[PDB]
Structures are given as structure tokens and as C-alpha cells.
Coordinates of C-alpha atoms and ligand atoms in Angstrom, one line a residue:
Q1168 CA 130.5 59.7 159.5
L1169 CA 127.7 58.0 158.3
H1170 CA 127.1 59.1 154.7
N1171 CA 129.0 61.6 152.4
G1172 CA 128.0 65.0 153.4
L1173 CA 130.5 66.7 156.2
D1174 CA 133.9 65.8 154.1
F1175 CA 134.4 68.5 151.6
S1176 CA 137.5 67.1 150.1
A1177 CA 135.9 66.4 146.8
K1178 CA 135.3 70.0 146.1
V1179 CA 138.9 71.4 146.8
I1180 CA 140.3 72.5 143.5
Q1181 CA 143.8 73.9 145.0
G1182 CA 145.3 72.9 148.1
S1183 CA 144.0 70.0 150.5
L1184 CA 142.0 70.2 153.8
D1185 CA 144.3 67.7 155.1
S1186 CA 147.3 69.9 155.0
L1187 CA 145.3 72.6 157.2
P1188 CA 146.0 73.0 161.0
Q1189 CA 143.2 71.3 162.7
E1190 CA 141.3 74.7 163.7
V1191 CA 141.7 76.2 160.0
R1192 CA 139.9 73.3 158.6
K1193 CA 137.1 73.3 161.0
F1194 CA 136.3 77.1 160.3
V1195 CA 137.0 76.1 156.1
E1196 CA 134.6 73.1 156.1
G1197 CA 131.8 74.2 158.6
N1198 CA 131.4 77.6 156.5
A1199 CA 131.2 75.1 153.3
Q1200 CA 128.7 73.3 155.0
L1201 CA 126.6 76.2 155.8
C1202 CA 127.3 78.6 152.4
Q1203 CA 127.6 75.3 150.2
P1204 CA 130.2 76.5 147.8
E1205 CA 130.4 74.7 144.6
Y1206 CA 134.4 74.4 145.0
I1207 CA 136.7 75.5 147.7
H1208 CA 140.1 77.0 146.5
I1209 CA 143.1 77.2 149.0
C1210 CA 144.9 80.2 148.3
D1211 CA 149.1 79.8 147.6
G1212 CA 149.6 83.6 147.0
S1213 CA 151.6 82.7 144.2
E1214 CA 152.1 84.5 141.2
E1215 CA 150.5 81.9 139.1
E1216 CA 147.4 81.8 141.2
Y1217 CA 147.2 85.9 140.9
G1218 CA 147.5 85.8 137.2
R1219 CA 145.1 83.3 136.5
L1220 CA 142.8 84.6 139.0
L1221 CA 142.8 88.4 137.0
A1222 CA 142.7 86.6 133.6
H1223 CA 139.5 84.8 134.9
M1224 CA 137.7 87.8 136.2
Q1225 CA 138.5 89.5 132.6
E1226 CA 137.3 86.5 130.8
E1227 CA 134.2 86.9 132.8
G1228 CA 133.7 90.7 132.6
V1229 CA 134.4 91.2 135.9
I1230 CA 137.7 93.2 135.1
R1231 CA 139.4 95.5 132.3
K1232 CA 142.9 95.2 131.4
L1233 CA 144.3 98.8 131.5
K1234 CA 146.5 98.5 128.3
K1235 CA 148.5 101.5 129.1
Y1236 CA 150.3 100.2 132.2
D1237 CA 152.5 97.2 133.5
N1238 CA 149.9 94.6 135.0
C1239 CA 147.0 96.8 135.7
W1240 CA 143.4 96.2 136.1
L1241 CA 140.0 98.1 136.5
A1242 CA 136.8 97.2 138.3
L1243 CA 133.8 99.1 137.7
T1244 CA 131.0 98.2 140.5
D1245 CA 127.3 98.2 140.7
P1246 CA 126.2 101.8 141.9
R1247 CA 124.8 101.0 144.9
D1248 CA 127.9 99.3 146.3
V1249 CA 130.7 102.2 146.0
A1250 CA 131.9 102.4 150.0
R1251 CA 132.3 101.4 153.2
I1252 CA 128.7 101.8 154.7
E1253 CA 128.6 102.8 158.2
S1254 CA 125.0 102.2 159.0
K1255 CA 125.2 98.9 158.4
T1256 CA 128.3 98.2 160.3
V1257 CA 128.2 96.5 163.8
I1258 CA 130.0 95.4 167.0
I1259 CA 128.4 92.5 168.7
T1260 CA 129.0 92.1 172.9
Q1261 CA 127.0 91.0 175.4
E1262 CA 126.0 94.1 176.9
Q1263 CA 126.1 97.4 174.9
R1264 CA 127.9 99.6 176.9
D1265 CA 131.1 97.5 176.1
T1266 CA 130.8 98.5 172.8
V1267 CA 129.8 102.2 172.7
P1268 CA 129.2 104.5 175.7
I1269 CA 125.5 105.2 176.5
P1270 CA 125.0 108.3 175.2
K1271 CA 122.9 111.2 176.9
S1272 CA 120.8 111.9 173.8
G1273 CA 120.2 108.3 173.2
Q1274 CA 121.9 107.8 169.7
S1275 CA 125.7 107.2 169.7
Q1276 CA 127.9 108.5 167.0
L1277 CA 130.8 106.5 168.3
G1278 CA 129.7 103.1 167.2
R1279 CA 126.6 100.7 166.5
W1280 CA 126.1 98.0 169.0
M1281 CA 123.9 94.9 167.8
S1282 CA 123.0 92.5 170.4
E1283 CA 124.0 88.3 170.0
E1284 CA 120.2 87.5 169.7
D1285 CA 119.9 89.9 166.7
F1286 CA 122.8 89.0 165.0
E1287 CA 121.8 85.4 165.0
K1288 CA 118.7 86.1 163.3
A1289 CA 120.5 88.4 160.6
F1290 CA 123.1 85.8 160.1
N1291 CA 120.4 83.1 159.5
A1292 CA 118.5 85.3 157.0
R1293 CA 122.0 85.8 154.8
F1294 CA 124.5 82.8 154.8
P1295 CA 122.8 79.6 154.5
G1296 CA 123.4 78.4 151.0
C1297 CA 125.1 82.2 150.1
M1298 CA 127.8 80.6 147.8
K1299 CA 126.0 78.5 145.9
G1300 CA 127.2 77.8 142.5
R1301 CA 130.8 79.7 143.4
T1302 CA 134.1 79.0 144.5
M1303 CA 134.8 79.7 148.3
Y1304 CA 138.2 81.3 148.4
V1305 CA 140.5 80.4 151.7
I1306 CA 142.6 83.3 152.3
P1307 CA 145.4 82.8 154.9
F1308 CA 146.7 86.4 155.6
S1309 CA 149.6 88.2 157.9
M1310 CA 148.5 91.4 159.1
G1311 CA 152.4 92.9 159.6
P1312 CA 155.8 91.4 158.5
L1313 CA 155.5 87.5 158.9
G1314 CA 157.0 86.5 162.5
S1315 CA 156.7 90.2 163.6
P1316 CA 155.8 90.0 167.3
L1317 CA 153.0 92.7 166.5
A1318 CA 151.9 90.8 163.6
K1319 CA 148.6 88.7 163.8
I1320 CA 147.0 86.2 161.4
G1321 CA 143.4 85.7 160.0
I1322 CA 141.9 83.5 157.4
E1323 CA 139.2 84.8 155.4
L1324 CA 136.5 83.0 153.2
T1325 CA 135.0 84.9 150.4
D1326 CA 133.4 84.0 147.3
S1327 CA 134.8 87.1 145.6
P1328 CA 137.9 86.6 143.0
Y1329 CA 138.3 90.5 143.6
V1330 CA 138.7 90.4 147.2
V1331 CA 141.3 87.5 146.6
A1332 CA 143.3 89.7 144.3
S1333 CA 143.2 92.9 146.6
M1334 CA 143.9 91.0 149.4
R1335 CA 147.2 89.9 147.8
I1336 CA 148.2 93.2 147.5
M1337 CA 146.8 94.7 150.9
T1338 CA 147.7 91.8 152.9
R1339 CA 150.7 88.9 153.0
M1340 CA 148.7 86.0 151.7
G1341 CA 149.1 82.4 151.2
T1342 CA 151.0 79.3 151.8
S1343 CA 153.8 80.8 154.1
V1344 CA 151.1 82.5 156.2
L1345 CA 149.4 79.2 156.8
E1346 CA 153.2 77.5 157.7
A1347 CA 153.4 80.3 160.0
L1348 CA 150.2 79.8 161.7
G1349 CA 150.6 76.1 162.8
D1350 CA 148.4 75.7 165.4
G1351 CA 147.9 79.4 166.6
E1352 CA 145.0 81.5 166.9
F1353 CA 143.6 83.6 164.4
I1354 CA 140.8 85.6 163.4
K1355 CA 137.9 84.4 161.8
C1356 CA 137.0 86.4 158.7
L1357 CA 133.7 85.3 156.8
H1358 CA 132.5 87.0 153.6
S1359 CA 130.1 86.8 150.8
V1360 CA 128.6 89.1 148.2
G1361 CA 125.3 87.6 148.7
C1362 CA 124.1 86.5 145.3
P1363 CA 124.1 82.3 145.3
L1364 CA 123.5 80.7 141.7
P1365 CA 120.9 80.7 139.9
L1366 CA 120.9 84.4 140.9
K1367 CA 117.7 85.6 142.1
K1368 CA 118.1 89.5 141.2
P1369 CA 119.8 91.1 138.0
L1370 CA 123.7 91.2 138.3
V1371 CA 124.6 94.9 137.6
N1372 CA 128.0 95.7 136.0
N1373 CA 129.0 92.3 136.6
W1374 CA 129.5 93.1 140.1
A1375 CA 127.7 90.7 142.4
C1376 CA 126.4 92.2 146.1
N1377 CA 123.4 92.3 147.9
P1378 CA 122.5 96.0 149.4
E1379 CA 119.5 95.3 151.1
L1380 CA 121.1 92.6 153.0
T1381 CA 124.5 94.2 153.4
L1382 CA 125.9 93.8 157.0
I1383 CA 129.2 94.3 158.4
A1384 CA 129.5 92.6 162.0
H1385 CA 132.5 92.0 164.5
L1386 CA 132.4 89.5 167.4
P1387 CA 135.2 90.2 169.2
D1388 CA 134.8 87.8 171.8
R1389 CA 134.5 85.0 169.6
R1390 CA 137.4 86.6 167.6
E1391 CA 135.0 86.7 164.3
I1392 CA 134.4 89.1 161.4
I1393 CA 131.0 88.4 159.5
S1394 CA 130.5 90.4 156.5
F1395 CA 127.7 90.1 153.9
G1396 CA 126.3 91.6 150.7
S1397 CA 128.9 94.0 149.7
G1398 CA 131.9 93.5 147.8
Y1399 CA 133.5 96.7 148.2
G1400 CA 136.8 97.7 150.0
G1401 CA 136.3 97.9 154.1
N1402 CA 133.3 96.0 153.9
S1403 CA 134.6 93.0 152.0
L1404 CA 139.2 93.3 152.7
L1405 CA 138.5 92.3 156.1
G1406 CA 142.3 92.7 157.1
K1407 CA 141.9 96.4 156.3
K1408 CA 139.2 98.3 158.9
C1409 CA 137.2 95.0 160.4
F1410 CA 140.5 93.3 161.5
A1411 CA 143.2 96.0 161.9
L1412 CA 141.2 98.8 163.4
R1413 CA 138.0 97.4 165.2
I1414 CA 139.0 93.7 166.2
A1415 CA 142.6 95.0 166.9
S1416 CA 141.7 97.9 169.0
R1417 CA 139.7 95.6 171.1
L1418 CA 142.9 93.2 171.4
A1419 CA 145.2 96.0 172.1
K1420 CA 142.9 97.1 175.1
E1421 CA 143.2 93.2 176.5
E1422 CA 146.8 93.1 175.5
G1423 CA 148.5 96.3 176.3
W1424 CA 149.0 97.9 172.9
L1425 CA 147.3 100.2 170.5
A1426 CA 145.8 99.7 167.0
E1427 CA 145.4 103.3 165.6
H1428 CA 143.9 104.7 162.3
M1429 CA 147.6 106.6 161.9
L1430 CA 150.1 107.0 159.1
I1431 CA 154.0 106.4 159.8
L1432 CA 156.6 108.2 158.5
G1433 CA 160.0 108.5 158.9
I1434 CA 161.6 112.0 158.6
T1435 CA 165.3 113.1 158.1
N1436 CA 167.0 116.4 158.8
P1437 CA 169.8 118.0 157.1
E1438 CA 172.0 117.4 160.3
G1439 CA 171.5 113.1 159.3
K1440 CA 169.4 112.8 162.2
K1441 CA 166.0 110.5 161.8
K1442 CA 162.4 110.1 163.6
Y1443 CA 159.6 108.6 162.9
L1444 CA 156.4 109.9 163.2
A1445 CA 152.6 108.8 163.0
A1446 CA 149.4 110.9 162.5
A1447 CA 145.9 110.6 162.6
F1448 CA 143.7 112.2 160.0
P1449 CA 139.9 112.4 159.5
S1450 CA 138.8 111.8 155.6
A1451 CA 140.5 114.0 152.9
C1452 CA 142.9 116.0 155.2
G1453 CA 146.1 114.8 153.2
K1454 CA 146.8 111.3 155.2
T1455 CA 148.4 109.8 151.9
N1456 CA 149.9 113.3 151.2
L1457 CA 151.6 113.4 154.2
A1458 CA 152.7 109.8 154.6
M1459 CA 154.5 110.0 151.3
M1460 CA 155.5 114.0 151.0
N1461 CA 158.7 115.1 149.0
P1462 CA 159.4 118.2 151.2
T1463 CA 160.0 121.6 150.0
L1464 CA 163.1 122.2 152.3
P1465 CA 166.5 121.2 151.2
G1466 CA 168.1 118.4 152.9
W1467 CA 164.9 117.3 154.5
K1468 CA 163.7 113.8 153.9
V1469 CA 160.2 111.9 154.3
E1470 CA 160.0 108.3 153.8
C1471 CA 156.6 106.0 153.9
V1472 CA 155.7 103.4 156.4
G1473 CA 152.6 103.1 156.0
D1474 CA 149.7 105.5 154.8
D1475 CA 146.6 104.0 157.0
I1476 CA 147.3 102.1 160.2
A1477 CA 149.4 101.6 162.9
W1478 CA 149.8 98.8 165.6
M1479 CA 152.2 100.3 168.4
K1480 CA 153.4 98.6 171.7
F1481 CA 155.6 100.3 174.0
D1482 CA 159.0 97.4 174.3
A1483 CA 161.2 96.9 177.2
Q1484 CA 163.0 99.7 177.2
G1485 CA 160.2 102.1 177.0
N1486 CA 160.3 103.1 173.3
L1487 CA 156.8 103.2 171.5
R1488 CA 157.5 100.6 168.6
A1489 CA 155.3 101.1 165.7
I1490 CA 154.3 98.4 162.5
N1491 CA 152.2 99.1 159.6
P1492 CA 150.1 95.7 159.6
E1493 CA 149.2 96.7 155.8
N1494 CA 151.1 95.3 152.4
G1495 CA 149.9 98.0 150.5
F1496 CA 147.9 101.1 149.9
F1497 CA 144.3 101.4 149.1
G1498 CA 143.7 105.2 148.4
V1499 CA 141.0 107.4 147.1
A1500 CA 142.0 107.9 143.2
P1501 CA 140.3 111.5 142.5
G1502 CA 142.7 114.3 143.5
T1503 CA 145.7 112.5 143.2
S1504 CA 148.0 114.3 140.7
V1505 CA 151.9 114.9 140.1
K1506 CA 151.6 117.9 142.4
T1507 CA 149.3 116.7 145.2
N1508 CA 151.2 113.5 145.3
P1509 CA 154.0 112.9 143.3
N1510 CA 155.2 109.5 144.4
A1511 CA 151.6 108.0 144.6
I1512 CA 151.5 108.6 140.6
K1513 CA 154.8 106.4 140.2
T1514 CA 153.8 104.1 142.8
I1515 CA 150.2 102.8 140.9
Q1516 CA 151.9 102.8 137.4
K1517 CA 152.2 99.2 137.8
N1518 CA 150.6 95.9 139.5
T1519 CA 147.8 97.7 140.6
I1520 CA 144.0 97.5 140.8
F1521 CA 142.1 100.4 140.1
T1522 CA 137.9 100.5 141.1
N1523 CA 135.5 102.9 139.8
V1524 CA 137.9 105.2 137.9
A1525 CA 137.5 106.3 134.4
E1526 CA 139.4 104.9 131.4
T1527 CA 140.9 106.7 128.7
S1528 CA 141.2 105.5 124.9
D1529 CA 144.5 104.3 125.0
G1530 CA 143.9 102.0 128.4
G1531 CA 145.0 104.7 130.8
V1532 CA 143.2 106.0 134.3
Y1533 CA 141.4 109.2 134.7
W1534 CA 140.0 111.2 137.8
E1535 CA 139.0 114.6 139.1
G1536 CA 142.2 116.4 140.1
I1537 CA 144.6 114.3 138.2
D1538 CA 145.8 117.5 136.7
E1539 CA 147.3 115.7 133.3
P1540 CA 145.7 116.9 130.1
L1541 CA 144.8 114.3 127.4
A1542 CA 146.5 114.5 124.0
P1543 CA 143.8 115.4 121.4
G1544 CA 142.1 112.3 120.2
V1545 CA 142.0 110.9 123.4
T1546 CA 138.5 110.1 124.7
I1547 CA 137.4 109.0 128.5
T1548 CA 134.9 106.1 129.5
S1549 CA 133.5 107.1 133.1
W1550 CA 133.3 104.3 135.7
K1551 CA 129.5 104.2 134.9
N1552 CA 131.0 102.7 131.2
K1553 CA 129.6 105.8 129.6
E1554 CA 131.6 107.8 126.8
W1555 CA 132.5 111.2 129.1
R1556 CA 133.2 114.9 128.1
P1557 CA 134.4 117.5 131.0
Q1558 CA 131.2 119.1 130.2
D1559 CA 129.0 116.8 131.9
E1560 CA 127.8 117.7 135.3
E1561 CA 128.4 114.1 136.8
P1562 CA 132.4 113.5 137.4
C1563 CA 134.4 110.8 135.5
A1564 CA 135.3 108.8 138.2
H1565 CA 133.4 107.9 141.6
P1566 CA 134.4 110.1 144.3
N1567 CA 135.4 107.2 146.6
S1568 CA 137.1 105.6 143.7
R1569 CA 140.4 103.7 144.6
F1570 CA 143.5 102.5 143.8
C1571 CA 145.0 99.0 145.1
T1572 CA 148.8 99.1 145.0
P1573 CA 151.8 97.2 146.2
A1574 CA 153.6 99.0 149.4
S1575 CA 156.9 97.8 148.2
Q1576 CA 156.8 100.1 144.9
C1577 CA 156.4 103.3 146.7
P1578 CA 159.7 105.0 145.4
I1579 CA 160.1 106.6 148.9
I1580 CA 159.0 103.4 151.1
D1581 CA 160.6 103.2 154.6
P1582 CA 163.7 101.0 154.5
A1583 CA 162.5 99.9 157.8
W1584 CA 158.7 99.6 156.7
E1585 CA 158.9 95.6 156.9
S1586 CA 160.8 95.4 159.9
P1587 CA 159.6 92.9 162.5
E1588 CA 160.7 94.8 165.4
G1589 CA 158.6 98.1 164.2
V1590 CA 159.9 101.6 164.2
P1591 CA 160.2 104.0 167.3
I1592 CA 157.6 106.7 167.2
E1593 CA 158.8 109.9 168.9
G1594 CA 155.7 112.3 167.5
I1595 CA 152.1 111.8 167.3
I1596 CA 150.3 114.6 165.1
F1597 CA 146.5 115.1 165.1
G1598 CA 144.8 117.3 162.9
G1599 CA 141.7 118.1 160.9
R1600 CA 140.1 120.4 158.2
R1601 CA 139.2 123.6 160.5
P1602 CA 138.2 126.9 158.2
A1603 CA 138.7 128.9 161.2
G1604 CA 140.1 129.4 164.4
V1605 CA 142.8 126.6 164.6
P1606 CA 146.4 127.4 164.7
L1607 CA 148.6 125.8 161.8
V1608 CA 150.1 123.7 164.5
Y1609 CA 150.2 123.5 168.2
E1610 CA 151.7 120.9 170.5
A1611 CA 150.0 119.4 173.7
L1612 CA 150.7 120.6 177.3
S1613 CA 151.3 117.1 178.5
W1614 CA 150.5 113.6 178.1
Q1615 CA 146.9 114.1 179.1
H1616 CA 146.6 117.0 177.5
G1617 CA 147.7 115.3 174.2
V1618 CA 145.0 112.1 174.8
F1619 CA 142.2 115.3 175.2
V1620 CA 143.3 117.1 171.8
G1621 CA 142.9 113.8 170.0
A1622 CA 139.5 113.3 172.1
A1623 CA 138.6 116.8 171.0
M1624 CA 139.2 116.5 167.1
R1625 CA 137.0 118.3 164.6
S1626 CA 136.7 118.4 161.3
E1627 CA 134.8 119.8 158.3
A1628 CA 132.5 117.1 156.9
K1629 CA 129.5 121.5 155.0
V1630 CA 129.1 120.9 158.5
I1631 CA 132.3 120.5 161.1
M1632 CA 131.9 117.2 162.9
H1633 CA 133.7 114.9 165.6
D1634 CA 136.2 112.3 164.8
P1635 CA 138.1 111.7 168.1
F1636 CA 141.3 110.3 167.2
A1637 CA 140.1 109.8 163.6
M1638 CA 138.9 106.7 165.0
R1639 CA 135.1 107.4 164.9
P1640 CA 134.1 105.1 162.6
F1641 CA 136.6 102.3 163.9
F1642 CA 136.4 102.1 167.7
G1643 CA 136.7 98.2 168.4
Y1644 CA 134.9 99.0 171.9
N1645 CA 133.6 101.7 174.5
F1646 CA 135.3 105.1 173.5
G1647 CA 135.6 106.5 177.0
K1648 CA 137.8 103.0 177.8
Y1649 CA 139.7 103.7 174.8
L1650 CA 140.4 107.0 176.7
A1651 CA 141.3 105.5 179.6
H1652 CA 143.7 103.1 177.9
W1653 CA 145.6 105.9 176.2
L1654 CA 145.8 107.7 179.7
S1655 CA 147.2 104.5 181.4
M1656 CA 150.5 104.7 179.0
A1657 CA 151.6 107.3 181.4
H1658 CA 151.7 104.9 184.3
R1659 CA 154.0 102.2 182.3
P1660 CA 157.3 102.9 184.1
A1661 CA 160.1 104.1 181.7
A1662 CA 157.4 104.6 179.2
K1663 CA 158.8 106.9 176.4
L1664 CA 155.6 108.9 175.9
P1665 CA 155.8 110.5 172.2
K1666 CA 155.4 114.5 172.2
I1667 CA 151.9 115.2 170.9
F1668 CA 151.0 117.9 168.1
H1669 CA 147.7 119.0 166.5
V1670 CA 148.2 120.3 162.8
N1671 CA 145.4 122.4 161.0
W1672 CA 146.3 122.7 156.9
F1673 CA 143.3 124.1 156.0
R1674 CA 142.6 127.8 158.0
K1675 CA 141.1 130.3 155.5
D1676 CA 141.2 133.7 155.6
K1677 CA 137.7 136.0 155.9
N1678 CA 137.6 135.4 152.0
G1679 CA 137.8 131.7 152.0
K1680 CA 141.7 131.6 150.6
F1681 CA 143.8 128.9 152.2
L1682 CA 146.4 130.5 154.6
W1683 CA 148.7 127.7 154.0
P1684 CA 150.3 126.4 150.9
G1685 CA 150.6 123.0 152.0
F1686 CA 151.7 119.6 150.4
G1687 CA 155.6 119.8 150.5
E1688 CA 155.3 123.0 152.4
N1689 CA 154.2 121.2 155.2
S1690 CA 157.9 120.0 155.6
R1691 CA 158.3 123.4 157.3
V1692 CA 156.0 122.1 160.1
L1693 CA 157.4 118.6 160.5
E1694 CA 160.8 120.9 160.8
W1695 CA 159.5 122.4 163.9
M1696 CA 158.1 119.4 165.3
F1697 CA 161.4 117.5 165.0
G1698 CA 163.1 120.7 167.0
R1699 CA 160.8 120.2 169.4
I1700 CA 161.5 116.5 170.3
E1701 CA 165.2 117.2 170.2
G1702 CA 164.2 119.9 173.0
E1703 CA 164.5 122.9 171.2
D1704 CA 163.5 126.2 172.9
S1705 CA 161.3 127.2 169.9
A1706 CA 157.6 127.3 171.2
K1707 CA 155.5 130.1 172.7
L1708 CA 153.0 129.1 175.6
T1709 CA 149.2 129.7 174.7
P1710 CA 145.7 128.7 176.3
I1711 CA 145.4 125.7 173.4
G1712 CA 149.2 124.7 174.1
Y1713 CA 152.5 125.3 172.6
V1714 CA 152.9 127.5 169.5
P1715 CA 156.0 128.3 167.5
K1716 CA 158.0 131.3 168.8
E1717 CA 158.4 134.2 166.3
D1718 CA 160.6 133.2 163.6
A1719 CA 160.9 129.6 164.6
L1720 CA 158.8 128.4 161.3
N1721 CA 160.9 128.3 158.3
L1722 CA 159.2 130.2 156.0
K1723 CA 161.9 131.2 153.4
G1724 CA 160.9 130.6 149.7
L1725 CA 157.3 131.1 150.7
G1726 CA 156.1 134.6 149.9
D1727 CA 154.4 136.9 152.4
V1728 CA 152.5 134.3 154.5
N1729 CA 150.3 135.9 157.0
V1730 CA 151.2 134.4 160.3
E1731 CA 149.3 136.7 162.6
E1732 CA 145.7 135.2 161.0
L1733 CA 147.4 131.4 160.6
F1734 CA 148.6 131.6 164.4
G1735 CA 145.9 133.5 165.8
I1736 CA 144.2 132.5 168.7
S1737 CA 140.7 134.3 169.4
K1738 CA 138.8 134.0 172.7
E1739 CA 135.9 134.4 171.2
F1740 CA 136.1 131.4 169.1
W1741 CA 137.9 129.4 171.7
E1742 CA 135.3 129.9 174.4
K1743 CA 132.4 128.4 171.7
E1744 CA 134.9 125.4 170.8
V1745 CA 135.3 124.4 174.3
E1746 CA 131.7 124.4 175.1
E1747 CA 130.9 122.5 172.0
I1748 CA 133.7 120.0 173.0
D1749 CA 132.0 119.9 176.5
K1750 CA 128.6 119.6 175.2
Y1751 CA 130.2 116.7 172.6
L1752 CA 131.8 114.2 175.6
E1753 CA 129.2 115.0 178.2
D1754 CA 126.5 113.5 175.8
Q1755 CA 128.6 110.9 173.8
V1756 CA 130.9 109.6 176.5
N1757 CA 129.1 110.5 179.7
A1758 CA 129.7 108.1 182.7
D1759 CA 132.6 106.6 180.7
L1760 CA 134.6 109.7 180.5
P1761 CA 138.0 109.5 182.4
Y1762 CA 138.7 112.0 185.3
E1763 CA 141.7 113.3 183.7
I1764 CA 139.8 113.9 180.3
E1765 CA 137.2 116.3 182.5
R1766 CA 139.9 117.9 184.2
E1767 CA 142.0 118.7 180.8
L1768 CA 138.5 120.4 179.6
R1769 CA 138.1 122.3 182.8
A1770 CA 142.0 123.4 182.5
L1771 CA 141.1 124.5 178.8
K1772 CA 138.2 126.5 179.7
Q1773 CA 139.6 128.4 182.4
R1774 CA 143.1 128.8 180.6
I1775 CA 140.5 130.6 178.0
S1776 CA 138.5 132.3 180.6
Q1777 CA 141.7 134.3 181.4
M1778 CA 142.6 135.7 177.9
Ligands
LIG577 MN1 141.7 104.9 156.6
LIG578 MN1 146.9 109.7 185.3
LIG579 NA1 131.9 95.2 136.6

């Protein structure tokens, strides 16, 4: 160089730019030149670093220590920055059709495309100088067990220590990742809260964000994730949704594998047999509940591999092998109780960061549906930092409030949850919240029918909406092409295609009362699936697929469960259902709907027409 402007060595407060692989230095230094951070901190992922970072956030008023627990912390956000924001989440490709099918109605529910030229303008209006007066943290992270053949590495730059702490929990991060990477490829992840110093606008609740300029972008062809303006969860912790679902699903398409919005659990029966199952559910359908369920059936065990995301690839033997690419759980707090999720309660009592929950007088946590009384004298501070009484109209915790907790701490974490080869998936479960019409459990008639069942997924938001594969907000590319990708798995010689099931825990009677007790009782449905995978003759054929035979389900210990209503299938309901599915698929998928999905649709309408 001719002057002193391109070498950022003098500003490195941890690590060394010289030590980084060539491409990692270029990524760091080039974005330092653009964002103008005061300091550069190359994260080592050590306990020392983590402790120091947390104490600093505490010293700044960014987080509070929760004194009741072992090393637990609370962040309360600006009320404007409280969730993943779909409307400001976009994917950039040369052609719109590579990102979303072109809808007949003109508005796609299946993603949000932005042109390269539009994004460049948006980028230029946000990032130049954005980290002025702040530290740029460099987070080297692995998605998946370090050195799993299914693992992928990222480098996230961020000006938020909250993101650093949370990424330590949610990914494998630090020096060993940099050493594992070498000169290999990595996903480029750029994040800024968008508040350069001196601050141009008021800081609310010591929580830096820029709501008006919030934009979460994915550029799969450039292997880049670029996120600006939000410090919250899926917007800022770039490994989780942006990388592990959006970028990864496109990589999966390119490379022959699957990046899915699925829990992974291992279930052991009383005959000492173990099987792994994956499950894709939409929001508020008991996903974490199922992943760390304690079964009510004696002699059965459930163990948790992951509660959110699965990366799956068929091996040389034809087994569908899955890994959890995450290193922790980022769960919705409200509704987490000893009765709904006792294992979550045990997990989150130490080494956990909470966001937007209430705090009790003795330094504990509180939220709606915690179902745990407080001793007289103990008072509650809401997530809005105000004194709170259960007589108030507003909740003590934000509905989207979170815990962020180490996976290793789950008392029923699966012994193979970090196995680099992954676990063999023998069943895949789709499901949604449906008050009417949809039986407790059915089984797809074939792989193609199963792909159709995923494609047709609907769930009560009240309004029933489509969430195919529970991937609606997360498709990395054209949904029609994603369906074709799924269907292509049947044409792999020797592929062992898992059995596909659909579940509905949420069927109500004519009064609005749930017909199924759920929770640990769901083990009875898992038992049925287990037997079906073993080839048990325990099914009855219906127009929608296989259901449990009369007396096939274990209902002992339950009272009088209304099986007729729970498993009832109405021609009138399913006529309406199939018509709605048809209209949705025609509109939203159009020219990109695979022939086999059109065929399954026709086949279902025909079976229904014959009842
Ligand atoms: Mn999720
Ligand atoms: Mn085919
Ligand atoms: Na705060």
C-alpha cells in the first residue's frame, strides 16, 4: 500500500489478521474498510472470552444477571425489535423464478425475491460506516459437529456482543473452527445493528437496532448472508435460519441432500429397539415438546438430537442420515412449564441467556404458562421493565420471548447428537394445528403421496394458513423445484425412503374441547409409527392414507377417548380440503408444480369422490 488505510492490524484487540486463512482475512478486512469499526475482535470461543463479554454487557446495561440461577442472563429489547421479520427478509438471484415460483395471483406466499440491482442500492444505503465507534466481532462457527462430513462453516461479522454470546451457545464457535476451516470455503455472514456512533437516534432500552432500515438478505450464488438493523434471533444469529435453512436448502439442492425445518428424536421401545424420527411442524404446534418428550408409556424412552433443524443425506448404504447443525436451543419461553416440557425446564436453569421474559424479585424468570406459583412477597418485573401484576391486560413476557440454552445440558440429549456420521432417519412426521377434519395420525400411501402430504400442510395461525414442509418462511429457492428435489429421492437406487406420517394433536369436538390430551400421551402415536416402520399389520386404509386399525392404538391409562371423532373422516370436509389444496398449489406453484404432485392431488380427489 501507499499509505496506511487498508491494513487494520493496529485495530485488532483479540487475535491476529496474519493468522487467518487468506479468504477469511479478505472478508474481515474488506468489511472493516466498509463498516469502519473502531476495533476488531477475532473470537476464540473460550470461556474467558464469554465471561468477559457478558460482564461488559452487564457493565453497559445491555444485559442483567439473573441471581437465582447458575450463570444466567436476561436481555430486554427495544419493543420494535422483538422477532424475525418476514416482510424485510429477501433472497437475491438473477431471475425471480429461481427464488420463488411466479404466482398466478401475483403475490407469492413462498418467499420474497429482490433483484441484484435493488439490493445493491439497499446495501449502499446501510453498511458504509455502520460500525463507527463499535467493535467488529469475528465469529468463526461450524454448523454441525466439527469435522462431520455434513457440517458447514461460516464466518459472521457483527457489532453486537449479544450475537457473539448467543452464537457461542447456538453454534460451535472459536479458534478450533478456524483451524478446521483452513483454506476451505465458508458462508460469508455480515451483520450490523445499524447504529454507528455517535448515535443519530435515541437508544431504547440499551438495545441497538434500526427498525426502519431492517433488511435480512441472502445471496446464495455469492455464498453471502447480509443482515442489517435487527439484533433479534433469526435476523442476527445468522447460523440458524439464514444459513441452516435458506442458504443450506439451496446448497442441499445443488449437492444432493436436504436442509429441513425438522426436529430429530431417538425413540427406544420396551423390546430394546431404537429408531430415529424427524418432524416438521409449523409455529406453536409442540415441536420442542415432542423433541424432548417424556413418554407416559412405561418402557419407552425419547431422546433429543435436535429441536429445530435437520441436515440429511443418504449414505452409500441408502440410509437417510441426519445431523442437528445447531449447538443449542433457541426456544419460545412462554408456555414452557414442568407439565408441558419438564426437560426444557431442567435445561434452562444454568448457562442460559433469556430475552424478553419477566424477572422475579429473587432474580428468577417468569412468563405466561410457566404454571409455577411464586412465594408471597415475590414480585414481577415485566419484559418492558415495569412492575407487573397478573391483573394487568399486557403479558409479563413478550409472546416471542426466548431462552437460548446449550444443547449438551438437555437431560435427555441423545448420545449420538454430536455423532459426525449422523443418525439414520426411519420416519418423517408432518403436522399442523387443525381444529376440524384431520385425524390424530395418518400414514402416507407412498413416497410421492408423502411429498404431497408435506406440500399440503396447513395450520391454524384465527385463520388456517399454508405452511408446506413447515418451510414457508425458509425456502432457499423455488418451492416447485424443492418438491421435485424431494421426489427425486425415490430414484436413488438403494435409497431407504423413510415412512411418512401426518399428525394432528389439536382436533377439537363440536364444543371447542381438544379430543387428545397430548404431551407425554403422544408417545402412544409414536408407538404406532414405530410398529408401522417395523412392518406391523396395524393399519386401516382410508382415502387420505393409512390410519390405526380398531384397537391398534394404546389407549390404556387414558379415560374414554372419543376415537370415532378423533379419527373421523368426512367426505364433505375433505372435498373442501382438496379443493383448497388444488387452488393453493395452482396459484402459488403454477408452472413449477411437479407432475407427481398434480397426480397425487388428482388421486386424493378421486378417492374422496368415491366415499
Ligand atoms: Mn424453527
Ligand atoms: Mn417419480
Ligand atoms: Na436492554
